[PDB]
Design an enzyme around this catalytic site. Structure first.
Site, PDB file in Angstrom:
ATOM      1  N   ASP A 223       7.457   3.489   3.315  1.00  0.00           N
ATOM      2  CA  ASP A 223       8.034   2.869   3.616  1.00  0.00           C
ATOM      3  C   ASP A 223       8.059   1.692   2.122  1.00  0.00           C
ATOM      4  O   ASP A 223       8.951   0.773   2.477  1.00  0.00           O
ATOM      5  CB  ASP A 223       7.327   1.910   4.060  1.00  0.00           C
ATOM      6  CG  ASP A 223       7.532   2.830   5.870  1.00  0.00           C
ATOM      7  OD1 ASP A 223       6.661   3.334   6.755  1.00  0.00           O
ATOM      8  OD2 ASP A 223       8.925   2.949   7.025  1.00  0.00           O
ATOM      9  N   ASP A 224       6.376   1.490   1.920  1.00  0.00           N
ATOM     10  CA  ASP A 224       6.340   0.527   0.480  1.00  0.00           C
ATOM     11  C   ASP A 224       7.472   1.214  -0.367  1.00  0.00           C
ATOM     12  O   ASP A 224       8.010   0.160  -1.242  1.00  0.00           O
ATOM     13  CB  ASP A 224       4.938   0.412   0.488  1.00  0.00           C
ATOM     14  CG  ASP A 224       4.261   0.186   1.206  1.00  0.00           C
ATOM     15  OD1 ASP A 224       3.601   1.126   2.316  1.00  0.00           O
ATOM     16  OD2 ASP A 224       3.043  -1.235   1.581  1.00  0.00           O
TER      17      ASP A 224
ATOM     18  N   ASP B  20       1.265  -1.116   0.205  1.00  0.00           N
ATOM     19  CA  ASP B  20      -0.071   0.487   0.023  1.00  0.00           C
ATOM     20  C   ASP B  20       1.074   0.847   0.319  1.00  0.00           C
ATOM     21  O   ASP B  20       0.702   1.633   0.962  1.00  0.00           O
ATOM     22  CB  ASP B  20      -1.169  -0.424   0.721  1.00  0.00           C
ATOM     23  CG  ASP B  20      -0.332   0.115   2.333  1.00  0.00           C
ATOM     24  OD1 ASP B  20       0.718  -0.772   2.315  1.00  0.00           O
ATOM     25  OD2 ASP B  20      -0.665   0.050   3.251  1.00  0.00           O
TER      26      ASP B  20
ATOM     27  N   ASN C 171       1.013   0.636  17.403  1.00  0.00           N
ATOM     28  CA  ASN C 171       0.695   2.445  16.501  1.00  0.00           C
ATOM     29  C   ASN C 171      -0.203   2.259  17.242  1.00  0.00           C
ATOM     30  O   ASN C 171      -1.183   3.326  17.231  1.00  0.00           O
ATOM     31  CB  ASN C 171       1.431   2.596  15.617  1.00  0.00           C
ATOM     32  CG  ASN C 171       1.678   1.371  15.137  1.00  0.00           C
ATOM     33  OD1 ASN C 171       0.981   0.363  14.914  1.00  0.00           O
ATOM     34  ND2 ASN C 171       1.989   1.589  13.700  1.00  0.00           N
TER      35      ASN C 171
ATOM     36  N   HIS D 124       9.929   0.946   7.676  1.00  0.00           N
ATOM     37  CA  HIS D 124       9.732  -0.483   8.343  1.00  0.00           C
ATOM     38  C   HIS D 124       9.499  -1.883   7.110  1.00  0.00           C
ATOM     39  O   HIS D 124      10.358  -1.899   7.049  1.00  0.00           O
ATOM     40  CB  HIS D 124       8.328  -0.769   9.086  1.00  0.00           C
ATOM     41  CG  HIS D 124       7.436   1.321   9.476  1.00  0.00           C
ATOM     42  ND1 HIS D 124       7.572   2.026   9.215  1.00  0.00           N
ATOM     43  CD2 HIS D 124       8.446   0.366  11.153  1.00  0.00           C
ATOM     44  CE1 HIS D 124       7.480   2.772  10.487  1.00  0.00           C
ATOM     45  NE2 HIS D 124       8.443   1.900  11.600  1.00  0.00           N
ATOM     46  N   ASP D 125       8.407  -1.959   6.318  1.00  0.00           N
ATOM     47  CA  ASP D 125       8.087  -1.774   5.461  1.00  0.00           C
ATOM     48  C   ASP D 125       9.498  -3.049   4.669  1.00  0.00           C
ATOM     49  O   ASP D 125       9.590  -4.423   4.388  1.00  0.00           O
ATOM     50  CB  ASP D 125       7.375  -1.570   3.616  1.00  0.00           C
ATOM     51  CG  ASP D 125       6.085  -0.794   4.360  1.00  0.00           C
ATOM     52  OD1 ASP D 125       6.152  -0.515   5.428  1.00  0.00           O
ATOM     53  OD2 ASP D 125       5.027  -1.438   3.708  1.00  0.00           O
TER      54      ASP D 125
ATOM     55  N   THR E   8       3.507  -6.105   3.267  1.00  0.00           N
ATOM     56  CA  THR E   8       3.927  -5.509   4.051  1.00  0.00           C
ATOM     57  C   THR E   8       2.345  -3.986   4.156  1.00  0.00           C
ATOM     58  O   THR E   8       2.706  -2.714   4.239  1.00  0.00           O
ATOM     59  CB  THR E   8       4.672  -4.138   2.751  1.00  0.00           C
ATOM     60  OG1 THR E   8       4.236  -3.603   1.703  1.00  0.00           O
ATOM     61  CG2 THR E   8       5.990  -4.992   3.077  1.00  0.00           C
TER      62      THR E   8
ATOM     63  N   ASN F 118      -4.009   2.988   4.584  1.00  0.00           N
ATOM     64  CA  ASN F 118      -4.371   4.323   5.001  1.00  0.00           C
ATOM     65  C   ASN F 118      -5.166   5.390   4.569  1.00  0.00           C
ATOM     66  O   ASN F 118      -5.946   5.735   4.688  1.00  0.00           O
ATOM     67  CB  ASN F 118      -3.302   4.753   5.851  1.00  0.00           C
ATOM     68  CG  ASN F 118      -3.070   5.660   7.052  1.00  0.00           C
ATOM     69  OD1 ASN F 118      -3.735   7.123   7.125  1.00  0.00           O
ATOM     70  ND2 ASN F 118      -3.445   4.582   8.525  1.00  0.00           N
TER      71      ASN F 118
ATOM     72  N   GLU G 244      -0.806  -3.078  15.864  1.00  0.00           N
ATOM     73  CA  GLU G 244      -0.043  -2.633  14.481  1.00  0.00           C
ATOM     74  C   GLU G 244      -1.613  -2.699  13.073  1.00  0.00           C
ATOM     75  O   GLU G 244      -1.872  -3.655  13.171  1.00  0.00           O
ATOM     76  CB  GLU G 244       1.233  -3.625  14.341  1.00  0.00           C
ATOM     77  CG  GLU G 244       1.777  -3.196  13.221  1.00  0.00           C
ATOM     78  CD  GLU G 244       1.266  -3.215  11.662  1.00  0.00           C
ATOM     79  OE1 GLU G 244       0.670  -3.987  11.772  1.00  0.00           O
ATOM     80  OE2 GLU G 244       1.206  -2.512  10.307  1.00  0.00           O
ATOM     81  N   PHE G 245      -0.983  -1.153  12.355  1.00  0.00           N
ATOM     82  CA  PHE G 245      -1.243  -1.092  11.624  1.00  0.00           C
ATOM     83  C   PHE G 245      -1.887  -2.270  10.374  1.00  0.00           C
ATOM     84  O   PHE G 245      -3.226  -2.348  10.451  1.00  0.00           O
ATOM     85  CB  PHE G 245      -0.838  -0.043  10.486  1.00  0.00           C
ATOM     86  CG  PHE G 245      -0.886   1.384  11.622  1.00  0.00           C
ATOM     87  CD1 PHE G 245      -0.925   2.364  12.520  1.00  0.00           C
ATOM     88  CD2 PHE G 245      -3.057   2.285  11.129  1.00  0.00           C
ATOM     89  CE1 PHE G 245      -0.781   3.661  13.248  1.00  0.00           C
ATOM     90  CE2 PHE G 245      -2.448   3.539  12.248  1.00  0.00           C
ATOM     91  CZ  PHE G 245      -2.515   3.726  12.487  1.00  0.00           C
ATOM     92  N   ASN G 246      -1.320  -2.099   9.516  1.00  0.00           N
ATOM     93  CA  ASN G 246      -1.226  -3.712   9.206  1.00  0.00           C
ATOM     94  C   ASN G 246      -2.414  -4.401   9.387  1.00  0.00           C
ATOM     95  O   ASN G 246      -3.163  -5.758   8.630  1.00  0.00           O
ATOM     96  CB  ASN G 246      -0.057  -4.012   8.404  1.00  0.00           C
ATOM     97  CG  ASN G 246       1.219  -3.553   7.703  1.00  0.00           C
ATOM     98  OD1 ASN G 246       0.277  -2.152   6.808  1.00  0.00           O
ATOM     99  ND2 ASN G 246       1.623  -3.726   6.913  1.00  0.00           N
TER     100      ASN G 246
HETATM  101 CA   LIG Z   1       2.666  -0.279   3.879  1.00  0.00          CA
END
Ligand SMILES: [Ca+2]
Ligand SMILES: [Ca+2]
Ligand SMILES: [Ca+2]
Ligand SMILES: [Ca+2]
Lengths: 312, 312, 312, 312
Positions: free
Chosen positions: A13-14, A9, A159, A239-240, A125, A38, A165-167
């Site tokens: 990061d991605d 997405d 987070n 992150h990703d 991711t 998001n 975590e979001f994902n």
């Molecule tokens: Ca991501």
């Protein structure tokens, strides 16, 4: 080279994950799939095509996936101040890379059923709704998959919530589905990715590469860093990419084999990745979590990849 | 001396807490209340009187509390092999210490409403059902209490479950009530009490005291250690005492002010103490969790107390 | 005369219940206890004393109970437009009836433990938090109680939610505790009380009584009816009284013996009273639900009682 | 003729539905999809082909769908005593009707996207996992669908649980997804299908038709009736066909427009279809529940259809 499918997405990061995958010789990017997150699916897909154009990736299909999470409604939570296309970067009139005609889910099922068994490594991711779908649609794929390395979750960190975590929080059901299939899962959560800091030393390093992509990455990163983590006095972190990094070299991070499940109905815990670190660990565990990260080896890989990409 | 009320469910841990409270000059044990736990309330109450007899505690009331958790059914889970009274120790024909006539909840309400405000410090080391009751019955008490220091919970650790600690898991509702009142709460969880190891060096030390209570403590500790933690290759640890220790000297352990709540309906998380360690911490937080423990300072206190008690 | 204890949260419904209990010769009102509800405990207590004054009830203790539900927070939801004391009626400078010195919970435990076994019939018409407390505090009472007849719940009906009734939704935990004790429970829910309509014919009838209490009842009923059910084109209905009615004559309504439980963690069902009407019914069932109501017999009792009270 | 797609899990109920759809001139059976249920998907699919062969249905694709519910595990619960193929009937060596090559989900998406808008009516009579998938995969379909008529749920009745019906309980998530889309939903639940009794008068009637299909229906019905409902002293009932019947003539049953949702995390309520019958009903309601059934009109349709099919 290790064949993979990057379901994402696109946000910086991605994007960095895409650069690393493309830039590294050890990885063979089979396709880039997109999922709602998001930002809307369309927004996210556009971003994907933009980074594909910037990294000069050609021959790799890009397919848009699910527009909504399995069961949970999506909190659009849109409010990017100086955002145009991606960060302060705007979209070109036309996109070089075109969109594959099939839905991301179909593409994944196709690729997996086309290549030989235990050849493809799935690397999500973003939300896992795209993966979850393929699993329920074509069960035969879980056995053909080499393994699954995803960036998401967090056993002692959160987070989107104190413990989630979001994902994962975004589509708990999809996460659950994925974590409970017979395949091997390596979860690169916040506990890990939190160590992947973007110290000024690192920025100087990447800036040194001096390529359009490098500049691009820095500009966007800086923009979004400002909005989020730049609210406090501490560097930003990617992150990703960490998921991709592991596939390239398992020694980039330490991991622990422990069972992991997804809470789906907790008033305060919905979306949490529950990890049982208790006394006697089961002998056979298809899941494991990332723990310590090799800061240097990680960044070196990123730089190296950026250098390899050059200026398309 | 700091006035306290020790609400417990006598097992070696609780016993040691009683010794430490009694033995230490800085603490003034107002009363010893009892709650149902791993063992029935009666069993637990008998154990309390027995340790009271051994430590030669006199003038301090002992009252039995709730026999069932607020809402959850209790899992009697009884199966002690060589258990008679407490461990391998048997009960004397008669108990020196007598049982106060009123229900533990009443006693608590009475004491609090009798003494001056912000004088008594509540120290629960078992389920919180007794405390929860008093709160709902006599609301005026939460404002009169100096503070609450309890042994229970765990932000990154669990035993009763991958993420939950017994004392809380046993009666989640009660915990919730307690953690949501306007009073100050200091949670001494597993993360902390895990550091309180009973190394052989420590045993030698306590055995050196050479008193009936010292021997008692060791004998029982050894017995139960064998059954539980002695299933693996690592020393046993005392928990409950840690709460009492903090009241005696806050410098015995480091703490962090972070919001805490109790999950009540999570399929996998029910009973978990959710702690929000996320980025921006609220300025006003009536709750805090224990982190690092001062091994030496802790044990010194225990030894010191045992020494003071002597041989009644 | 059947001895009872009326635990309520005075609103017109509860008030009429009090009138019926007092006015009927078959009932011996032992005490009137109070619980928090739609309005604060104090507000509700004041209201109780006011109706006690109006019905000229003397010799019957009135005690204030719990101010908050067991675990759930209370939604004060206050917004009465032309409300002064109770409806449009104002409080007198002083109350004739005084408040008992002990907390409702204590009073209940006392009364029950004082009288002979299977003599007192508990009749809660508000949240059950008061009863629930007593049960956990003094277990011996559930065996001494003749039975429990409460107004609340709904097996195929709801108001606070598509499937849950206020009294239960307000404090699910309390309801749960009560419904799971070994005693006999008769649940008079919405399915039943919905049949207790205040047709104009009935109003004329009560107005005919022509006493201060009658007038009072009508005035308040009318006021509140206007606010709630008078938003639609259908008569108002009294609930609480139906519970007391049953105690006076079981033939006022038909009942069915079926197991009942309280949902405590359902996203949409929390607070619902689950009733298993399925094929094979258990031979032993301590719980039963009200079904059909004898309209005339019911109202006749109310009028008769009003007539008996007269003008104190 | 009204075009429909029959998604089912072939058991006598589903079979009768197929007979009714095929036999009735007002219905144009576009395809027959299959979903996992009480029996495995394969088992269920074989049964579909068998009835297809019996009814002499040709030209109508048959496609197998999902083999597992979205998130919940499936309780195989298999134990049919004298069961071979379907009931006491055995499978022929070869099946006349062949299996379409594509997954039921794909077929559905294809058909919908092929025909003109608001032309196809979806009629699921098993779990909804198949439908839910298509919706998430191709969102454009919910707008193109004329409406949804499904057999499942129960507002005041339950079988799989005191408050839940199988088709829904089996895959709650799927159900939720479906009930929360912007399309029109007509839920034919137990409350309704319970009235569709197979009185001896009816059997005599169908036996009178004297065709292989009629015989087939009776034999199977009788076999399964014996196992389930024949454990008590009351006739059996067909459910699934009622959904089809409604599409043929809305006057076969009375319906009520009321909001409906699916409980997903209730300890006792998971899988229940929550229907808000409360006082003020919303003006716009895309959902409605079946209430009273026209016994005669219903059966007449069934007989008529059987007559029309004849002996292929
Ligand atoms: Ca991501
Ligand atoms: Ca303890
Ligand atoms: Ca009431
Ligand atoms: Ca079916």
């Amino acid at each position: 080279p290790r064949k993979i499918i990057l379901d994402c997405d696109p946000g910086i990061d991605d994007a960095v994950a895409i650069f690393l995958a493309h830039g590294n010789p050890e990885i063979e990017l089979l396709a880039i799939t997109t999922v709602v997150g998001n930002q809307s699916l369309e927004k996210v897909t556009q971003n994907a095509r933009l980074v594909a154009d910037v990294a000069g990736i050609v021959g790799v299909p890009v397919a848009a996936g699910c527009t909504k999470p399995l069961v949970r409604g999506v909190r659009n939570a849109s409010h990017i101040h100086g955002e145009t296309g991606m960060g302060n970067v705007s979209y070109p009139p036309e996109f070089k890379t075109k969109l594959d005609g099939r839905h991301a889910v179909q593409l994944i099922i196709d690729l997996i059923m086309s290549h030989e068994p235990k050849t493809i490594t799935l690397v999500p991711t973003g939300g896992l709704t795209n993966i979850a779908m393929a699993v329920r649609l074509e069960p035969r794929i879980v056995d053909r998959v080499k393994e699954v390395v995803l960036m998401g979750g967090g056993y002692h960190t959160g987070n989107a919530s104190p413990v989630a975590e979001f994902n994962v929080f975004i589509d708990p059901e999809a996460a659950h589905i994925v974590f409970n299939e017979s395949w091997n899962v390596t979860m690169v959560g916040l506990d890990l990715t939190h160590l992947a800091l973007a110290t000024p030393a690192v920025q100087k390093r990447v800036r040194e590469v001096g390529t359009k992509p490098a500049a691009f990455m820095l500009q966007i990163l800086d923009f979004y860093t400002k909005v989020y983590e730049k609210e406090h006095d501490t560097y930003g972190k990617v992150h990703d990419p960490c998921a991709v990094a592991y596939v390239i070299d398992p020694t980039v991070m330490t991991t622990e084999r422990v069972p992991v499940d997804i809470e789906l109905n907790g008033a305060l815990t919905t979306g949490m990745t529950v990890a049982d670190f208790r006394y006697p660990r089961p002998k056979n565990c298809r899941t494991q979590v990332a723990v310590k990260l090799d800061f240097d080896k990680f960044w070196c890989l990123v730089i190296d990849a950026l250098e390899r990409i050059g200026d398309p």
